[PDB]
Every structure is written in C-alpha cells, then in structure tokens.
C-alpha cells in the first residue's frame, strides 16, 4: 500500500495495513508548514541567545543553562546512545515498521521542532524496507526502544533487511541515507513519545479483532453441531437489553447462521429443549468483548495520531512549554482492557468445546469419536484448551495499576504500557489455540450429522478446514490437526466471513 | 426527590440520586400499555392452552411440558424460596433501594409479562423506605439477591424499616400492602436480571467519580504547596495529544488553579525547573482515569435501563423467547474497568503525598514539619497512603476472567459481576483514605508559605479542612486528623468545586 | 488459660489458645535477668554520655547526636502519638489481645532495653482484659497498630472494657495503672516490631486448619453420598508419591472413613466405575493444601518469638546494633503461601458440590430433591459455592510481591504482610461457605440413601449438621439453612473427628 | 556426569547435573526385582483372566470390561496418538532430557507394570542425545508432553539429534533402536505422571537459586559502593530474629563481605547514619526469599522421584488400584511459591540501583556519571530495571488457584502446575536483568572511589564484570553492557562465591 500521509489523521484500518504488510509513503506537501515552522522557532530562539528547557539547555544542573552549540549538538548524540539501554528479543519487522510510521505520523504533525530531513531519514527506511534493531523490554511507557531504532540513523546500533541483520552503515545506505547529526531538540523528539507502547496495543487489538472474528463463526458452527437453537439471536431480545455490542454481535451470528439451514430444519423441534449459556449468552458475552475492544480502539486510535514527545514547540504563539505527554497511562489501560475480551473470548470457547465432549450435552457421540471404548478422540484436545484458557486468567493481571519511581523520584509515576500491550500478544495465542479446537471439533460434529450441510458462510468455514485436515475416523495423532487449524486462524482464513464495518479496523 | 418514571429513560444524575437519597416515585401513565400488553399476552398463551417455556412450563424434566394452573403458581413460590440461597453481610438500604428502582425500571418496559400489580407493589416498597433484607454475596450474575427481595412481597424474609428488622407480614403492612401470591412468569421476571451486579458496579461508578473531583482539588493543592508549575495544564498540550479525558481533565485543573495565584506569583520564577510527574503528568494519568470511567459510565448507564429477565415477551407479535440477557459480562468488565481508574488515581495521590515528604523536591521542611530532629510530623501518615495505595493492585485483579459451571453444566459460563462490582467499595476506601492524606499534607504545606493564597476554589477546599483540623504545629495524635478529612470526603465536601458536566452522573 | 510465660517458647498451640480466649499470664522468673540487663546497659550508654542511635540520639538530623535527657523523654511521646495514624476498622478483641501477648512475648527476650515495669503494664491491660483501639489499617509491614496500641499505656487513645469503649485514664484504672511515662528506646521498642503482621497471618492460619479439618469430614461425607470408592487412600498409594502432606492427609480420610460402611457395604461393587478427581484425587490437593500451610505455620511460629524491634541490646558484649527485624516479608509470603491453601481446598469442595448435583455423576436425584420438575432442592446453594470459590482466585493475588518507598526513600523497601495476612479472613469466610454448602448437600444426599449410615465419625458430623438443619423433603427458603450450617463450622463442629497432631497448631 | 541410577534417589544436585548437562545412565542391579514383579503381576492378571481397570480393560463404557488382547494392544497406540495434543513452542533438549530422566526414574522404582526392555529404551534415547519433540504447552498438571516424548518409542512424531530434528526411525537408529509396541498398561505407565510439571519447576527453582546467589553478590556490592555498614549483617540480630532463611543468609553476606574492606576502613565511620532498608533489611528481605525457595525444593526434590503414575501395581499384595497421584497440585503451588521469591529477589535489587543513582543517598555522583548536565550514564539502565521488576508482579499471580474440568467432568478438578512452573522462566529473565544492571552499577560506583578495594571475593565479582564491560567513562551505547552482564550471570559466574551448603541443589 502507498500512502501519501496526512499526518494525524491515520484510520485503524490504515494502521491494520501498515502492521501487515510493507508500506511506501510520502508526506502530504500540506504537513511541511506546521514541521518546518516549529523548526523555524527552534531557530529562532537558539538566534536570540533566549535559553528553553529541552531546546538549547542541558538536564538537571543545566537544566536552566544555555549550554554551547557544540556541547548542544554533542548532547543529542550521548542522549541517544545513553538511553538505547533496551534489553529482550528483537522485536519482528512488522512491529518495527509500526513504530517508525507512528513516529513519523506524531512528528510531522509540527509540534515537535525536529527537521523535515530527519523525518524524511525515517521515511526513506521504511520505504527501503530497512528496520532497525529495537529490543522487546525496557520501557516503562518509549526512551529505550525509540532511542535504538534512532541509532540507525545516527550509524550506530544495526538494521534488519530481508531478513538479515546490517550494520548501521550498511543499513542506511541501502535507503539511500548517510548518518546523520541532530540538532537541538530532535533527541527529545525522536526519544521522547508512546509510540512502541502503542504499538504493543494496537497488535493486541488487531489480534482481538481477528479472535472475535473468528469465534463467531466458530460457535456458530458449535451451535449447529449440537443442534442448537437460533431463537438467542433474535435482535428483539438485544434490543431490548439495549448494549450495542451484544446488539451487533447478535447482527453478526444472525448474518452467518441465517434464518435456518439444513441441519436446523432437520431437527424439526430443537426447541424443546434450552441451550447451554455458552451458546445461548454468546451475544452477551461476545458482545461485551465487542464493546471493550472498541472502547480500547478508540484510545488507540487517537493516541497513534498524538504529538507524544516534549517540550512542544508552539510556533504560531512562540512558545515552548514542557508536559507529560509522553506518559501512555491511556495506553496501559487500553490494553489491559483488551486482555478482558481476549481472556473472555477464549473462555466461553473452551465451554463451548467442553460442551462439545459432553454425550449428555451434545446429542454427539462422547468426545467426537466412533467406538469410544477404544478410541479416545477429542479428550485431550479439550484438555489442551482448557490449559490455554486458564493460562489467560493470571495474563489478565492489570499492569497499569503498577509504577515504580525513576529518574531519581522526578519521573515519579509511570504507566508500564509496554508490558501492558505486549502481554496480549501470548494471550491471543492462547485463545487462538483454543479456537483452533472448537473450529475442528464443531466440524467434526457437523460431520457426523450424515450429509447435513450449516449456512452458506458457516460451509465456508467447514471447507477453509477441512481443505487441510480430515474428518476424524479414529485415533490418529492429533496435534498436527491443531498446528494446521491455528495456522488457518493465524492467516485470517475466517474474517472474512463477518460483515463489514462491525470491527474498529476491519 | 419526586420521580414520574418513564421506564427505561433513567439518567445516570437520577441514579445517583436515587443512590444517595429516598425517593417517592410512580410510573408514567405511558408505562402501563406495554405492562399491561405483555400480560395478556402471557393470559392469552395460557387460555388457549399453548406451551412456552418459562411461561407455563416446568424445568428440565418439564420444561417442555405444560404444568396444571395448580402446581403453576406453587412452582412461583417454590422458586422464590429456593432461589433464595445468598450469604453475607446484609446490603445497606441505599443499595437495596438502588436494585428495587432498577428492578421496577426493567420491569416496567413491558417486555417481562408481570402484572402491573406486582411492580407497584415494589414501588409501594420504595415509597414507603422498607428494604428488603438482601445478602451481599451468592450471586454470579442475580437469582439469590433478587430472591431476598422478592421473599418481602410474598410474606417471607424481613425488611428494615427506620433502621430496625422488621417481619415481613409488618414490613407489607407499614407499605399498605398485604401478602402477593405470583402468577405465571412472575417468578422468573423478578428473580432473572442483572439489578444487583448493576447497583453494585453503579456504587463504584459514583465513588470513581467522587475521588475523581476530590483528586483534582487536592492535586492541584500539591502543585500549588510545591511550588509547581501551571504549564502543564496548558490546553494546547492536550489538544495535541488528542486524547478526551486528558483534554477535559487539564480545563478542570486550569478552573481550579486559574493562570496564577499569590502563591504561584510570589515565587517569581518556578519553571527553571520541572515538576516531576506525579504533577506535571496529572493530566495524562487523570486523563485515563476519566475516560476509563466514562466507558464504565456508559455501560452501565445502558444496562441500569436493560431489560435483563428472561424468557422475554413479545406482545405485538405475540412470540415468548428464550435468551440470555440476565448474563452480566458487560457489567463485570465495566467494573473491572472501574477499578483500574481508581487504583490509579490513588497511586498518583500517593506519588504526591511521597513528594511533599521529600525535602529534595518539596521545597518544604522534611515531613511537613518544624524541628524534625525529634517531631516526625507527616511520616506515618504517608506510609498509611502507602499501603491502602498497595491495597489496591491486588484488589485491582480481574474478576470478569473467572467463571464456574453451574446448574449441572446448563449454566455453563458466567460473569461474576457482583465480585467485580464489590470490590471496588473497598477500593474506594483505599484511595479515599490516599487523598484524604494528600489534602492533609497539602494545606499543612501552603500554612508553611506563611500567609500565601492559592486560588479561589483551592482555598475553599483549604477552608473545608481547617474547619475540622488543624495546623501542624508539633507532633500529636495523629490518626483523628486523618479520619476527619477522610469523612469530609465521603461527604461530598470537594466535589462541588470541579466544573459541571465533566463526570458521567454529575 | 493461665500462662507463665518462658518469653520466646510460645507453641503454636498456645498461640490458638490466645487467639480463642482471655488469658491470664505471668513472666517466668528466669525472663527477668535479660529484661533487666538490656535495660541496664541502656542506662549504662546513657550514664555515660556515649551516643547511640535510637537510644539517645534524634533522627535524620539528630541521628548521630545526643538529644538533652529532656526532649529525650519527650521524644518517645511525640513518636507514639505522631505513629498512631492507622485507619480503617476497629481490630477485635481477640486479635488485639493476640498482638499484645506477641508485643510481650518478643519484648520479654531482652533484647529491647525497654523497662520491665512497662511490659508488665502491658500484661496488666491483658489479664484486665482492657484491649487499645487498633485500627486495621495503615501498616506496611507495624508502626501504626503498635503505636495506637502503646496510645493506652500513656493515657492517650481509648480502649475496650466488655464490649464498650473506655477512655485511656479509666482503661488504665480498671487494670490497677496509672499513665507511664516511656524512657530512652521505649518508644521504639513498641513501636518496631511485625506482631501485627504476625498476628493476622496467625488469624488466617488457625482460620485454614479449621476448613482443613472440616473439608475432611466434609468430602468424606460426599465420597459416601455418591457411592464412591475408599481405594484411592489406600497407604501404598501416598507412600509411593512420597508428599508427607499428601501421606497425612489420606491417612485422615482413612481414618473417618474406615475401611468400609453399612453404605459402602450396600453398594457391593462401587469400583465397577471411577470416581472423578474431586474425589479421588483428595489427598494429592487437600495434601498439598497441607504442606502449605505447614510451611507457613513454621514461619509464623518462629515469627511469634522474634525479637522484632530495633535497635537491638546485646547486653552481655555491650552493643547496641541497628539491623531490619521489623521488615515482615518472611509473614508476608506466608500469608501469601495460606491464600493458595485456603482458595484450593475452597475450589476442590465447589467440584464436590457440583458432582453431588449432577444427576449423572452422583447417583442421587438431580440438585438433591425429589419431584425436580417443580423443586429446585440445591441448584442455587451450589451457585453461591460458585460465587464464593471464585472470589477467592483473585483475593489471592500475592501482596508480598509489592512495595513502595517510604520515609522519603530511606525505608525503601517494605513487605505490605498486614495487607497479606488480612485478606486470608476473607477468604476463610469464601470457603466456609462453600464447605457449609458441602456438608449440607452430602447429608442431604445420605439422607435420600434411605436408612443407612456412613461411619462413625462421619455420623457424627451428619448427627451435627441435623440438630440444626433439617432433610430437604420440598422447597423452602434456603439461606438459613446455610447460615446455621456455617455458624457450626465457624465454631468448631467438625474439627474434632480430625486425628490429633496433624495440624500444626492442634 | 556418569549415574548408576537407584530408582527414587535423585537428589536436588543430580537433578542440577541432569538439567544442566547430558547424561548417561543405566538403572542399578537393585531396580530390575521391582520392575520386573510388577510386570509379572500385570502379566498374571492377564493369564488368569482378571479384569482389572486401567491393565486390560478400555475406558468408560469398557472401563469394567475385559478388552480382547488384539485391541488391548491397539489401545496402547490409540491412547499415546490421541493424547499427543500439545502445541506450542518445542521444549529445548536440557528439558527433554530432565523430562526423560524423571520418567525413567518413576517408572524404574517398579510400581508401574512397564517392561524394563521400554525403561531401557528411554535410556537409550536420553544415553544416545535423542531428545524426542515435546511442544511447550496443553497440559493442566502431564498427559500431552508425555505422549509426545512416548511417540518416538513407538516410531512416530520427531526427536533432536545434534540440534537438527530427524524422523523417528532415524532418531531410534542413532540410539541403537527399533520402533516398540506397547503392551498392557505401558500406555497409561508412560502417559499418565507429573514430570512435565516437575521439570518445569524445578527449572524455575534452579533459576531462583542462582539468582540468589548473584544477588547476594550484588547486594554486597552496593552495600560497598555506597559506604553502607557490616552491622546489619551481624550474627547476633538474626539469631534473635531465629528465621533461618534470614541467618543462612546473614552468614553468606558476612562470608562475601567480611569484617571489613579497604573501601570500608578508609570512611572510617560509616554509621553516623543508617543505611536505607534496600541494604539493610537484604537478610530479613534474601532471607524470606530462601526460605521460600527451600519449601518449593523440598517439595519439588520428593516429586522428582514420585511413583506418579496410574493405577499402581502392588506386586507383594497382588494389588492393583486406582488413585489419583498424576494430579500434580504441589508442583502448582511449589511453582507460585517460587514467584514470590524470584519477584521478590528483583524488587530488592531494584530499590538499590534506585538507590545508587540518587545523589542524595549514594554518596556518588548523579546517576553515577561524571560530569552530569550533559551525561546521563545510568539514568535508562534504571528505567530497564524498573521494567522488568514490575512485569514480576503481574507475573506472581498464582496459577495453582485455577481450574477447568476435563473429561467431561469426571477429570474435574486439574492443578495447572505447567503454567505455573514456565512462567518462572520468564520471571527469572526479567530479575536477571535487574541484577544484571544492579551489578553494572555497583561496580561503576566503586570505581568512582578512586584506587579502593572491597572483599576478596567481591572483587572477584568486579573483575569478573570488567574482563568484560568498561568502566563507564562518557555516555555510549548502553545495551550491549546490560547483554553482556546478562550472559555472565546466565553463565553462573558469581554462583560460585556463595559458601556451600546453602541452596538446595548446590
């Protein structure tokens, strides 16, 4: 995708992409006006000898005093190399591409006093493909990890290229570049800001998305298998409970279960007889997922479009004023709300399967399996399950609620936003995980509903599996089966069946 | 306060009156054709000898078969008082007023096919101040709480009346009412819902937003004591960041601090230094405060007006559904929402209280005190804030998260609404007793500014206190202090300073 | 119970004992000579003018200096009263005394240099049964508790007499004392100390023996209700896994069950089937539940004789040193460590309810009640032992794991035991209720097994709960039946059948 | 390390060998008697026609039912591929290996009724270095990663040889084998056990040994670079204490710091002030923490050599019987115990790199860096350490509180033990990093004081430091000092300085 960037105004789905996939962009020629004003005010206070924390003054003993241009310009360089402390696995291109777009969104909205040049430098590296080194820990929410994927571009610290890690020199070349030197003001620009914090968050939510997706159409195909009633779904009982996303979470299972299928109306009178909560509230349940993604969404969405950095440059007025807002508390608790709903999505699923395993539950045979004496079918994929499903409870422990003082007590409170996204990504693993086995226990159940087929997108979902793994006629070994249904799910293979416009970025 | 309910209209101002306060209310002449509806329609499915579940049916066995009239209207009772299975300690009479209101507010939608009978007795209830007994716990979200209160209108339970137990025969009879015996799905319609997840959540709601007012007062008392700095809170900052809360919290810090005071002007210079940012990121932290409560707000606004019973009736079309509205998810994560804003905006208090015990940064007398080599002054009392802060992460732990099979795997996923919302009181007290600490510690650091003014609303709040305690002079008693600033607070003493129309029910 | 106490040998017995009721004690003669010498030598660093931190000297400032005889005295007093600023809830009787038979227990080591007289003041208030106002919260781990506690020996604070509060003066009075005036190191040696913390470890610890004990019986009851086996306690089975407290633990169940009953017997061939892992699996998690809290019941027993204060007198080589006892984390993880045992022996109990309520797995009628179109017997207790097992997963989050600076940073690192200890009170309430539930569904269970008995303590127990509580023949208002279920394990019914030196401290 | 194995022996140190280091093994003459009467007793019940669960029956249908031999054999395969349900990342081989030895020593004490002819395959493979695949996750406490280990035995699934995966045949071959058939019970002897569990935390308890080791280390260390006192070390305080964990741990630091030092001779008097409770209270602090780690090792020493299977074969009675010993709740709680102590060893060592940077506690310059205003030298490192302290709390919370029912809910209650031991893993990565950076500082402070020695064996760990990371002279690149101390803890260079006998396994 080629983007011509306004900055500021980057939509979910924009950022959805850029997590994705590779991007090529260019600054709207509207964005260099506010970038270089702010410049120009930095310019002009350095010119009138006027002295400004975090522009032309050292920190702490200097942090009133007008240090001189050359210290000034030798401090941007100690700056960077002194915070890039960061420590862990590096973290995957996709997420360092996220981080450079998001700095270069925040600082080209012109509040921050850093040339076009080293915007540009950046641009030029993501259009380049080239990424820099940036370890996982360190941040207590972004000096440590914006301070290396900085040093690149100062020729330090290295840079990954298909695939393979280049030394600085090498790296910035390859985009065309040579090292730069900073100027007064671009270390705390380029160090200072939420970006990686909002990185984290953002992957969260767009796994959530995919989690949500996905489990739609799952226990849709779990209340067909178990002959399951769509009297839940009708949008006069969400309605009248009035929660909008249990109100579009309804929408969505009406949409892929439609009015009847064969298999409904083959079972005559299911009524009968009630369904289980983890079919039943799943519109409730789902739905409160739903709205906690989307209350997350909207502090993301915002906040990768913030001027995150300090001390902000005010060029129409002149002024230059020191803030916090670098502090991402909004973030933490944006993805500590969204471990709720990934927790919850992957709950009602195990119950799901477990009713699945359950002869008097399920008018199945017990575990999905034929000749069950010998035969031990499903058990332990359930078993697995409800690990991960567990697994999800203690992840969902807040960090937000967390802060240890720095900075020798000036930087005193602290939001742990880093730690607060980056805990989802493993808890989406774990509620794929459990998916992945209710999507391959509902289609075994289907399957021994003799030739009866579900909706027309839930046939979707039965074909997307079993293109890649078969009915299960007796024991064989199993996890191959899961590894293959979860590399489905990780590769999108259901989102494409829920309706438009329901998701944040989708 | 006098109420005309058009039900499902409740705003949350009214809910927090009706929370604070008795209330005298009737239904709107426009209720009762809906009520009204949904009963005959009930009759109707009766006289002409149809089955529907949870109409005229049994369970289980029976929940496909049409019980005579006879063990009908025992299967009520046998209901009520089964259902009644709560333990703990019994609710106070503004909370069971608060699950009354709402459970008449629900019922009276029309969507329940409960006589209106029924509901006006509940009013009758409300209007004359007898509450139900009501234990706290039992529920996993509200069959036993909702039973308790239930048990009054047909003869059983007790209820308190002007602060004393009363039997139910005299609890009915001080209302004008006498023994009611129910009919068909009045059983489920009182005791399905989710009321008492709700009131509990909603309590929490209201002290988020208590401590939330008192916290900028005092806070901005902190800045102030310390000498900090306005800037900030300039509006620029936060618009460039973009982020709502932050945006509304820094304009009400700027009402109450106003662009300079005595104190702020007599210290000529104050920026040639930085705030740390227990001041200096109060917009930010606040900030995430205020939006996480307004998406609790939100929730549980739409919810106080749901209706939550089940199986729902239909009238214009004449269909009985059942579904699964009584599932309180959303409230269970609007609660576990609720707590991460009050844990933080007691950790940033106590991040302020450490601050001004720190003669490095408070410019103040170690410990807020004179002659310190033998008085302690504020010591203990911040280590108080300390661990009432401390509290607060462990309580903050995730309750949306768990959930347990019941009703023999039927009832196979649930919320645990009621723990999330309980918690929060607790947590309520914690950051309560933190910033009653704060506003102790702050007024006794400006008294040090001898004779120096901060702003018109802050030297109110300076007033507030000093009616009821003291200068610190030299080390005495000092616990008192603390308890008379904490229950200045539970009165509602600072939060008439912070501007209208910032807080979801103020 | 009358003491002599040989300061520093308290059993955990006794210490149950103390925490049960009143006691009335005396120091053994041999206590005396080390009181007295620390004393001494405290006169002896004062008579000859040699300085000493925490016994002559100031702090902070004055911490290295020789504070004049006169602010020295006065010194102690502004420390306690300064100190006194806890919060919260008024501490029973029961564990205020226990706090201050440690407070004496510890002191009467004598390594503390505080006066004999002065302790034994505090043994007068003890045997007078006069008990200081503790308020419950405030300590990081006990300076507040300690410091409201020492209120009373200075004619300062208040105190309980019978169940009313007493001013100090007349507290003191009723226990033939006059006001004392503290001398050099007093105050600190009240003051320091982790008794506090200790004695709310020591509350949940006796609290987590009781449900142990009770969930015996308990479980034992349901294994026979359901016709399950007494094979999975055959010794062979504990001896070969090798965990003592597993090993422990079977030969109870061994012990109540005995090797078969007129039930068992009447089922000829109960093995012909498994018994699910809330069964069978008894003595591996009630096992490690016991291992548990014996780990943390020989911390809290070595906790209960420590010398906890400082500085501390060594006497017969003349120092005096400043070291950390005051620093709870070893109470703090303790308590910690009983949360697990206590959620898990509540969480195992829940699984027994539930099994008892499945018409499939219980071979009992479904929810324990005859005639279930129309009864609904137990479903809604089991729904309450739902709600109390899941509160307890959050009420364990560890609080050891906690800290935040204090005293400007000088005491940097705390343990945050009392937060610890006190949460476990709580969770003791969770799973009595579940275990109360327990007791009553099993019985009910044996009841519909017309005619025939379990053994003979097992007949005790069901002979225990029926004096109370009646068979559940229809549906009738449940609560009471659960309250005066919980009362009777609250008050030791069942503890008893339990063999003797089993748990640590019966 | 060469290990005749006498089956049930493995001590805390062999079990460190085998999980450090590759292995060869074969089982002592004296284990064949016991192995092989259980075979035989299996065998008899065969030959006379018994039937007996669990040896030749099938599963709940046909769990009371004689299989024929032809599918008795079949269900031996059936159960390991259909229990071979794991996913996740593949354990790395020290763990296989751990895996595989436990394995062989529980089936090898002979209550099992396996073939010694299978127990020496698996010693072949662990002999020969083939580590059969066993992905991370599935098991709820270990039926998944013991059936993958047992798919190789059976010429299925995959295994390690020299770091590449070869196929199973392959793999068998460089062990010397051919593919096994299993008979009668071999597939529940193999399947059913706690090993996985047990490895996992048993790994977490030798991470949390050599972390305390290192920090005792570091501890002292800092307590030298900021002219902190010997007194609080001294025997005397902890005696009176009587914790041992804490006098085993005063006794390490006085052994590491001695009596005194050239740094601490040359400031003479360095007690006119009291050290900060970071330093002073480590004994008490270091102290819980051992003892902590010595309850889980006790615990996690008797399960290595656990008969964990099921049934059990009592060969000298003829017995065989059905219990529950797989369930692995002590490993789950062993496991929580070691967070807090693995927490708790970080947050310690994270207030004294606080400490450290604060000029007005350090007695060193700010952030321990010459020539401040325009260096930051430690200031980030700080930060990192904050960061991955703080993710510990989150990390704590308990695992073995959680539980799913399994099986349909006849496996109704499961430990979680997996989980709770693997996030040890990660605990330990993070207070590595603490300590890491904690010895970084320490050693730069020295430094600072010009030309001044400390310990013998402290400077032991300052050269150990510096053969690899310089002196920080001017601001540079951080993070590859912060990687390099990292990998010398990893690597166990300062385990070596801790006296003998203290930790479990050393």
Redesign the interface.
């Given at each position: 995708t080629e983007l011509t960037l306004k900055p500021?105004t980057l939509t979910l789905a924009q950022l959805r992409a850029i997590h994705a996939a590779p991007v090529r962009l260019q600054l709207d020629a509207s964005a260099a006006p506010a970038i270089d004003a702010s410049v120009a005010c930095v310019e002009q206070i350095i010119a009138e000898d006027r002295t400004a924390?975090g522009i032309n003054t050292?920190?702490?003993?200097?942090?009133?005093?007008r240090?001189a241009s050359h210290?000034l310009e030798?401090?941007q360089?100690?700056?960077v190399?002194?915070?890039?402390?960061?420590?862990?696995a590096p973290l995957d291109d996709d997420l360092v591409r996220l981080i450079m777009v998001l700095k270069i969104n925040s600082l080209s909205?012109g509040?921050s006093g850093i040339r076009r040049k080293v915007i540009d430098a950046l641009i030029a590296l993501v259009n380049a493909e080239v990424y820099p080194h940036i370890?996982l820990?360190?941040?207590?929410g972004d000096?440590?990890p914006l301070?290396?994927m900085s040093?690149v571009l100062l020729g330090?610290?290295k840079a990954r290229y298909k695939g393979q890690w280049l030394s600085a020199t090498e790296a910035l070349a390859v985009a065309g570049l040579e090292p730069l030197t900073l100027a007064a003001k671009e270390g705390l620009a380029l160090l200072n800001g939420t970006q990686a914090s909002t990185a984290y968050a953002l992957r969260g939510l767009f796994y959530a998305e995919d989690l949500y997706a996905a489990a739609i159409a799952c226990g849709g195909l779990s209340v067909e298998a178990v002959l399951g009633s769509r009297?839940?779904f009708?949008a006069?009982?969400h309605e009248?409970?009035?929660?909008?996303?249990?109100i579009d979470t309804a929408a969505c299972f009406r949409d892929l279960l439609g009015d009847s299928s064969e298999v409904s109306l083959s079972h005559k009178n299911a009524?009968?007889?009630?369904d289980?909560?983890?079919l039943?509230?799943?519109?409730?349940?789902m739905?409160?997922?739903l709205?906690?993604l989307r209350?997350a969404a909207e502090?993301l969405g915002?906040?990768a479009?913030?001027?995150?950095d300090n001390p902000?440059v005010?060029a129409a007025?002149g002024?230059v004023?020191?803030?916090?807002?670098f502090?991402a508390?909004?973030v933490?608790?944006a993805a500590?709300?969204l471990?709720?709903?990934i927790?919850?999505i992957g709950?009602?699923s195990?119950?799901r399967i477990?009713?699945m395993?359950?002869?008097?539950?399920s008018q199945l045979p017990?575990?999905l399996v034929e000749n069950?004496?010998?035969?031990?079918?499903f058990?332990?994929?359930?078993?697995?399950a409800?690990?991960?499903?567990?697994?999800?409870?203690?992840?969902?422990?807040?960090?937000?609620?967390?802060?240890?003082?720095?900075?020798?007590?000036?930087?005193?409170?602290?939001?742990?936003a880093?730690?607060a996204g980056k805990?989802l990504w493993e808890m989406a693993?774990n509620t794929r995980?459990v998916l992945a086995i209710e999507w391959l226990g509902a289609c075994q159940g289907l399957d021994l509903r003799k030739g009866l087929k579900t909706s027309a997108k839930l046939e979707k979902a039965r074909q997307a599996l079993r293109s890649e793994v078969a009915h299960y006629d007796?024991?064989?070994?199993?996890?191959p089966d899961?590894?293959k249904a979860?590399e489905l799910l990780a590769k999108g293979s259901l989102t494409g069946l829920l309706p438009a416009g329901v998701l944040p970025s989708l």
């Open positions: 500021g924390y050292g920190f702490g003993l200097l942090a009133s005093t240090i210290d030798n401090l360089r100690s700056l190399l002194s915070h890039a402390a960061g420590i862990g909205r509040f370890p820990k360190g941040s207590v000096l440590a301070a290396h040093l330090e610290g009297s839940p009708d006069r009982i009248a409970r009035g929660q909008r996303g249990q009524d009968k007889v009630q289980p909560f983890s039943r509230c799943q519109p409730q349940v739905g409160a997922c709205t906690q209350q502090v915002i906040e479009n913030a001027v995150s902000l005010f007025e002024d004023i020191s803030g916090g807002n502090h508390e909004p933490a608790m500590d709300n471990a709720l709903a927790a919850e709950s009602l195990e119950r477990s009713l395993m359950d002869k008097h539950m017990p575990f069950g004496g010998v035969n031990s079918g058990m332990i994929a359930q078993v697995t409800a690990a991960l499903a567990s697994e999800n409870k203690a992840l969902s422990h807040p960090h937000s609620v967390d802060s240890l003082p720095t900075s020798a007590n000036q930087e005193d409170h602290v939001s742990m880093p730690a805990r693993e995980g007796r024991d064989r070994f199993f996890a899961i590894e979860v």
